[PDB]
Amino acid sequence: TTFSIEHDFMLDGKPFKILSGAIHYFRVHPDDWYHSLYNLKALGFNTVETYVPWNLHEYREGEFDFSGILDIEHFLDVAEDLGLYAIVRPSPYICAEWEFGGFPAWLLTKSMRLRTDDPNYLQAIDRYYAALMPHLVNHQVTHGGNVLMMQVENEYGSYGEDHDYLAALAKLMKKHGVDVPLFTSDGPWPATLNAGSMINDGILATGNFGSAADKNFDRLAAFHQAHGQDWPLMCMEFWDGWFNRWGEPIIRRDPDETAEDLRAVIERGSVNLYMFHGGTNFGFMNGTSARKDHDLPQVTSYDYDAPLNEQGNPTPKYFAIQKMLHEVLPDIQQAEPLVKPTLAPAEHPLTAKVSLFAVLDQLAKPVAAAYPQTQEFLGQYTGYTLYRAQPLISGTDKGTPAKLRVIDARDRIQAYLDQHWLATQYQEAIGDDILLPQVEGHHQLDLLVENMSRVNYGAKIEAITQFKGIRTGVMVDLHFIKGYQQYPLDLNQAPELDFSKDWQPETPAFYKYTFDLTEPHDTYLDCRGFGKGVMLVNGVNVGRFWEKGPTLSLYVPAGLLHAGQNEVIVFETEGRYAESLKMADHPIFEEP
Amino acid sequence: TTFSIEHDFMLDGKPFKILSGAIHYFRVHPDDWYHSLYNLKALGFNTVETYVPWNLHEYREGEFDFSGILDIEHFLDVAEDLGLYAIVRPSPYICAEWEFGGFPAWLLTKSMRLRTDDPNYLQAIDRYYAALMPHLVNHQVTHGGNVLMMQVENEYGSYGEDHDYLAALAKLMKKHGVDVPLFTSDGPWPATLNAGSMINDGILATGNFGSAADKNFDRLAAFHQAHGQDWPLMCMEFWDGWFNRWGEPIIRRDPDETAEDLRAVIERGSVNLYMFHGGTNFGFMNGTSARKDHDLPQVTSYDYDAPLNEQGNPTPKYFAIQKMLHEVLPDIQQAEPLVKPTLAPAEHPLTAKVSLFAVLDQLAKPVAAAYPQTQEFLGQYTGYTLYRAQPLISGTDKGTPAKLRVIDARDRIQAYLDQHWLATQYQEAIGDDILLPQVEGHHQLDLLVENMSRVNYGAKIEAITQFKGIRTGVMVDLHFIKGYQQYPLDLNQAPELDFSKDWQPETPAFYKYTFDLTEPHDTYLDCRGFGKGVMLVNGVNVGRFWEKGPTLSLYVPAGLLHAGQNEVIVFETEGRYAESLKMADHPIFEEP
């Protein structure tokens, strides 16, 4: 296969229209890759597109992983065998409604200005690319594979205008053997395109939008023409749905209107559906939005109201788009989409339960320090961090109870004295006075701090709030306390816990539901009756839950289950839990 | 003279009651030191007390100054010659309602945790003490001088409980030859005393309070006794007035009640009046209070409703205290206090005026950078910093005006495009959208940023907001801009400015009032008719003004004036100025 960019995309010397769909391999169990890709082919599309998440492939510095759900080579193979081409977007920053926009948390511990011409930043990318690009180079069409082109950065005109950065990053990609055509994507209007594109370097600029295709392509064309380029018009992200956030209602886009809006793109050029199949933000990898200085975390589900639902099954939107495509491009071969079944509903009794405080040393090796550090400096890049102190409590000026204040912490703190709950503070409320029990002497202060994920877009990508944990300290009366034990909790140790140890009410705890399955199928965990936390299925954290809503369940793919004895462990922080774990055949929702 | 601490203070073998008054040499023109000290002796007091401000003595790292108003040796000499003893408090942190509580701003550029057992912190103190302590050592009573005692830290129980820090600091003081008795001062209640005192090291703990002397001395005594110490009770700060902040009304404490409250201290032990004579926060050296995350800057005047007013003249409170002391201790010799005159009122016409933008290169050598730094990294530790960029302005998504946002800046920003005012944002408002003119191409963006002073007490001493200037960047539309010229303005160059250059309305500008005086006297500059800024008298910045109030004038001592041709230069940022500078014989006030 040959691929180059002229007036049209030229594939094997012939004008080509790219019909792409976004599937993030890292958001879908590898057992279901074939399924989703097949359904992309069945729609009538010729290409699949995916980001590459730096913060999963190099979760810890120097510890690379390209196995299982991170095996991008196998992903691209399955696509090729189904006769799909591919677009890869291996930017250090991917946005993607994803923890820190894809940046590894350990970058925060370095002296480094992200998304700029910073030598330490570019070097770290160089070292990342040394591990990644061997898994991509030979998948290029130039090496007999199916990868047509690769993106430089991601919507950089929506963050900066450092052109030396873009040029340096492109050079890095080429140095690691990327010889396929390169491109940028941006909002299709002058300010973003001027700042974000590499048009003066002869590199194709594309546009991201979800409507008004004529308006947007007109501006994109105008930009091309102003730089004397004769290029194809491609919507590199056609937002055919939207993401959801905790406490905000679900956003639903009419299937047929979506098709109509997509029609106008296809008439005038190429397109990539964002998303085609969205899948799931497993573990702690959800992203976070920011309005001014206020953060708004995104939910576990990345359904995205996409053509395929979270599970991977076809929606009315899929069929409306399939119908529309056959009207506009009748020669494209189509097929019926595959549909996966769901487990029959069931309820499983509580097997055992144990409090966090009882099993602390199975979860983490404590780091002693005079004063506290954020989790990144403890070598923890996601999840929960417990800070323990033994503060002296003593009489106050006015005789009233001594005030506890947490100074400079994110995102959510729970405070305990002698393992009894005092207060819960979220974001801006952190720093408000917490009245201590009127007691005497030294007492055990516990602060469980949750990282609810780092902002993935906009001004706050490098905000001081991107550091998670306690940054400054904790005050009793008028003084900062000294002497902490810092527990970076690894909840992936949850299956090794000794549940025969004690449980206490109104306390973070683990709850085990052990149960037998005759045959594994896709299913939904009902999270109603639990307060807040995460759930692990056979040792794998499938994501967060919160009574706040609107999502009140967790998708669990069949691949995480097996015939025989299965195990779900719930980590729950509010003290609200269910006597039986219910599994349902549909996703549960509530109005927030 | 001999001095030691037993049940009483022992001076020359005999029980001694310390009657001290706080006079900050650095807040009073050296010509008026004799005056203020004389009035302290005339009150019937035997001792004077002063802080030592690290951030004036070592304003820039390695540049020590002990001359003029910073000549502590001459200060202590004048006191001795008047037959006063002295207490010096040479802590790195002095609080004192003073810029950064006395810490040099360049400490922020170092890797260092303030007021803790940090080796880099202690080292920097060691180096400071190498320069300072030679100016103190020989003034000790042990070397024939008049200094009785010296404080370790300042109200450390109102910040931390790191005892290794206190012990290390005491050791530093002794290493530099401090052999006089040491003490700590704190709020007189267990929590502060437990955290802050050095009682277990045999070092006297004292208490700070402004009322309820029996309640407070009872707690202080109880603390002493609990550690098996038999010690004198001393109020190391008797708050006999209070400080003021911009936008808050003046606080006035009844003269006679003050005397009564002070009586109860003197009956039971020793005392130091805070303040006896408060004087003036010259230049930019005012302090700042914090409530949670919200900063509240203190005013230029440090009148403090003290026995001596800002000028140094005796108030009803002085006389009430003098009377009270003669009742309780009739043998103490007293005298009539000295009273200084004031200039007769006058008005001086505007001589010349010039805009800041016209004289930028006389004020500062610009530092070029791709991205902005806070003033500390530019070598500027107080005052105003102008950031200049040349951002490309171009069409937006919706066609509406492009939004300007300042990301992470403190304390107050003024934005201009092509030297025309756009917006002014204070503290929390910084980051709100500023609508740019609907224009095209590159344009000059100017951001004048004011440091209104770093927090001097409490949780925020090491807050990220203690960095002044632009920390993160400036956004146009969705992108951070690249390319700044950074001007660290030195307003002390104001007399060298070429005023024949152009002036423009609604623009930061300098306004010169040149005028003749037959004989110099103390006076007040009337700041009504000016918006906000500072005033320099014969090249010396006498402090800030603001129409906000309640203080609407600036005290000017006679020592800053001379017979012949004098010069006042106003730097004013809002665009509101007076055609004539009025000088009044009393301080002007307005209701905020």
Token pair in block for residue A123: 């070097």
Coil, helix or strand at residue A262: helix
Residue of A nearest to B372 (CA): A113
Q: Which of A192, A292, A478 sits opposite B192 (nearest CB)?
A: A478
Coil, helix or strand at residue A215: helix
Q: Which of B209, B465, B480 to mutate to test the interface with A (most CBs of A within 10 A)?
A: B480
- Bridge-partner residues for A476, per DSSP? A404, A479
Tell me if B389 sits within 8 A of B484, measured CB to CB: yes
Q: Which of A158, A402, A405 sits opposite B459 (nearest CB)?
A: A405
Ramachandran angles phi, psi of A546, nearest 5°: -160, 125
Binary contact (A431, B292; C-beta < 8 A): yes
Write down the catalytic residue from A49, A80, A237, A572: A237
Binary contact (B395, A116; C-beta < 8 A): no
Q: Which of B159, B475, B477 sits opposite A479 (nearest CB)?
A: B159
Residue of B nearest to A474 (CA): B459
CA dihedral B435, B440, B442, B446 (to 10 degrees): -20
Burial label for B409, CB within 10 Å (0-12, 13-18, 19+), is buried
**Residue B178's closest CA among B3, B423, B417?**
B3
Binary contact (B479, A190; C-beta < 8 A): no
Task: Name B174's Cβ contacts closer than 8 Å, sequence gap at least 6.
Answer: none
Ramachandran angles phi, psi of B461, nearest 5°: -60, -30
Helix (H) or strand (E) holding B459: none
Binary contact (B191, A482; C-beta < 8 A): no
Residue of B nearest to A458 (CA): B478
Task: Name A570's Cβ contacts closer than 8 Å, sequence gap at least 6.
Answer: A510, A511, A513, A530, A533, A534, A535, A536, A577, A581
Using a CB-CB distance cutoff of 8 angstroms, which residues of chain A are in contact with residue B187?
397, 478
Token pair in block for residue A566: 């299965």
Burial label for A50, CB within 10 Å (0-12, 13-18, 19+), is buried
- Bridge-partner residues for A536, per DSSP? A541, A569
Helix (H) or strand (E) holding A477: none
**Residue A247's closest CA among A450, A525, A460, A546?**
A546
**Residue A227's closest CA among A244, A204, A247?**
A204
Any idea which residue has 């005030």 for tokens? A403
Residue of B nearest to A188 (CA): B397
Using a CB-CB distance cutoff of 8 angstroms, which residues of chain A are in contact with residue B472?
459, 462-463
Q: Which string of DSSP letters, residue by residue, matches B95-164?
A: -TTBGGGG--GGGGGSS--TTSS-HHHHHHHHHHHHHHGGGTGGGBGGGTSSEEEEESSSSGGGT---HH
Tell me if B376 sits within 8 A of B470, measured CB to CB: no
Q: Which CATH architecture is the domain A3-328 placed in?
A: Alpha-Beta Barrel (3.20)
Task: Name B551's Cβ contacts closer than 8 Å, sequence gap at least 6.
Answer: B244, B250, B299, B300, B301, B545, B587, B588, B589
SS percent in chain B: helix, strand, coil, step 5: 30, 30, 40
Binary contact (B191, A157; C-beta < 8 A): no
How far, in whole angstroms, is CA A477 from its chain's centroid?
40
Token pair in block for residue B363: 């004020």
**Residue A50's closest CA among A113, A114, A132, A122?**
A132
Total number of residues shown for chain A: 592
Any idea which residue has 């193979």 for tokens? A77
- How many C-beta atoms surround the C-beta of residue B396 within 10 A? 20
Q: Which string of DSSP letters, residue by residue, matches B28-57?
A: S-GGGHHHHHHHHHHHT--EEEEE--HHHH
Q: How far apart are the first and last CA of chain B?
A: 51
Strands (E), A210-278: 234-239, 270-277
Distance from CA of B420 to the nearest CA of A (A): 22
Binary contact (B191, A476; C-beta < 8 A): yes
**Residue A219's closest CA among A152, B403, A208?**
A208
B550 cis-preceded (ω within 30 degrees of 0): yes
Token pair in block for residue A151: 């993106």
**Residue B101's closest CA among B381, B455, B376, B380?**
B455
**Residue A378's closest CA among A370, A366, A363, A361?**
A366
Three-state helix/strand/coil letters over A391-419: CEECCCCCCCCCEEEEEEEECEEEEEECC
Using a CB-CB distance cutoff of 8 angstroms, which residues of chain A are in contact with residue B392?
161, 194-195
Binary contact (B477, A396; C-beta < 8 A): no
Ramachandran angles phi, psi of A10, nearest 5°: -110, 110
Residue of A nearest to B220 (CA): A397
Q: Which of A158, A191, A394 sits opposite B191 (nearest CB)?
A: A394
The yes-or-no answer on residue B155 being catalytic is yes
Binary contact (B157, A478; C-beta < 8 A): yes
Task: Name B195's Cβ contacts closer than 8 Å, sequence gap at least 6.
Answer: A392, A477, A479, B156, B157, B160, B161, B186
Task: Name A590's Cβ contacts closer than 8 Å, sequence gap at least 6.
Answer: A528, A549, A550, A552
Token pair in block for residue A537: 């299925």
Token pair in block for residue B31: 């010509």
Distance from CA of B127 to the nearest CA of A (A): 25
Tell me if B207 sits within 8 A of B216, measured CB to CB: yes
Strands (E), B451-576: 469-476, 479-480, 484-488, 509-517, 523-526, 532-537, 540-546, 553-556, 564-572
The residue type at A29: H
B483, HSE (Cβ side, Cα atoms, 13 Å): 13
Interface contacts A/B by beta carbons within 8 Å: 129
Binary contact (A407, B459; C-beta < 8 A): yes
B340, HSE (Cβ side, Cα atoms, 13 Å): 26
**Residue A141's closest CA among A106, A173, A104, A180?**
A180
Any idea which residue has 């004769």 for tokens? A230
Binary contact (B370, A116; C-beta < 8 A): yes
Using a CB-CB distance cutoff of 8 angstroms, which residues of chain B are in contact with residue A395?
189-191, 219
CA A474, CA A389: separation in Å to the nearest integer? 9
Tell me if A474 sits within 8 A of A407, measured CB to CB: yes
Q: Which of A113, A117, A189 sits opposite B395 (nearest CB)?
A: A189
Using a CB-CB distance cutoff of 8 angstroms, which residues of chain A are in contact with residue B370?
116-117, 162
Token pair in block for residue A526: 């009902």
Parallel, antiparallel, or unpaired for β B403-410 and B434-435?
A: antiparallel
Any idea which residue has 């510095």 for tokens? A61
CA B50, CA B227: separation in Å to the nearest integer? 29
Total number of residues shown for chain B: 592
Tell me if B542 sits within 8 A of B282, measured CB to CB: yes
CA B373, CA B371: separation in Å to the nearest integer? 7
The secondary structure of residue A119, as a DSSP letter, is H
Instruction: Round the CA-based radius of gyration of chain B to a whole number and report it.
Output: 25
CA A306, CA A312: separation in Å to the nearest integer? 9
Coil, helix or strand at residue B92: coil
Domain spans, chain A: 3-328, 356-489
B52, HSE (Cβ side, Cα atoms, 13 Å): 30
CA A249, CA B444: separation in Å to the nearest integer? 43
- How many C-beta atoms surround the C-beta of residue A492 within 10 A? 14
CA A514, CA A512: separation in Å to the nearest integer? 6
**Residue A105's closest CA among A157, A53, A156?**
A53
CA A417, CA A507: separation in Å to the nearest integer? 12
Task: Name A413's Cβ contacts closer than 8 Å, sequence gap at least 6.
Answer: A406, A424, A425, A430, A447, A448, A449, A450, A470
**Residue B90's closest CA among B141, B36, B135?**
B135
**Residue A299's closest CA among A346, A256, A352, A250?**
A250
Sort residue B558 into left (φ over 0), alpha (ψ -120 to 50) or beta: alpha
Task: Name A218's Cβ contacts closer than 8 Å, sequence gap at least 6.
Answer: none
In chain A, count of helices (H) and strands (E)?
10, 34
Q: Which string of DSSP letters, residue by residue, matches A521-561?
A: -BEEEE-TT--EEEEEETTEEEEEEETT-SB-EEEE-GGG-
Distance from CA of A247 to the nearest CA of B (A): 24
How far, in whole angstroms, is CA B118 from its chain's centroid?
25
CA B16, CA A281: separation in Å to the nearest integer? 74
Q: Which CATH architecture is the domain B356-489 placed in?
A: Sandwich (2.60)
CA B405, CA B480: separation in Å to the nearest integer? 9
Coil, helix or strand at residue B549: coil
To the nearest 10 degrees (0 to 180), the angle between helices A255-268 and A213-226 is 30
Token pair in block for residue A222: 């105008």
CA A40, CA A273: separation in Å to the nearest integer? 10
Task: Name B363's Cβ contacts closer than 8 Å, sequence gap at least 6.
Answer: B356, B487, B489, B490, B491, B493, B497
Burial label for B416, CB within 10 Å (0-12, 13-18, 19+), is buried
- How many C-beta atoms surround the C-beta of residue A289 within 10 A? 18
**Residue B37's closest CA among B89, B75, B1?**
B75
B275 cis-preceded (ω within 30 degrees of 0): yes
- Bridge-partner residues for A526, per DSSP? A553
- Contacts by A332-336 with C-beta closer than 8 Å and gap 24+? A332/A19, A332/A44, A333/A44, A334/A42, A334/A43, A334/A44, A335/A41, A335/A42, A336/A42
Residue of A nearest to B293 (CA): A431
Binary contact (B482, A162; C-beta < 8 A): yes
Parallel, antiparallel, or unpaired for β B9-11 and B14-16?
A: antiparallel
Write down the catalytic residue from B49, B97, B155, B572: B155
**Residue B48's closest CA among B100, B87, B15, B99?**
B87
SS percent in chain A: helix, strand, coil, step 5: 30, 30, 40
The secondary structure of residue B370, as a DSSP letter, is S
Q: Given CA atoms B554, B557, B560, B562 in this order, what sign does their dihedral have?
A: positive
Tell me if A353 sits within 8 A of A511, measured CB to CB: yes
Query: Helices in A477-537 by DSSP H: which ranges?
Result: none
Task: Name A272's Cβ contacts closer than 8 Å, sequence gap at least 6.
Answer: A18, A20, A21, A22, A47, A49, A87, A234, A235, A236, A237, A238
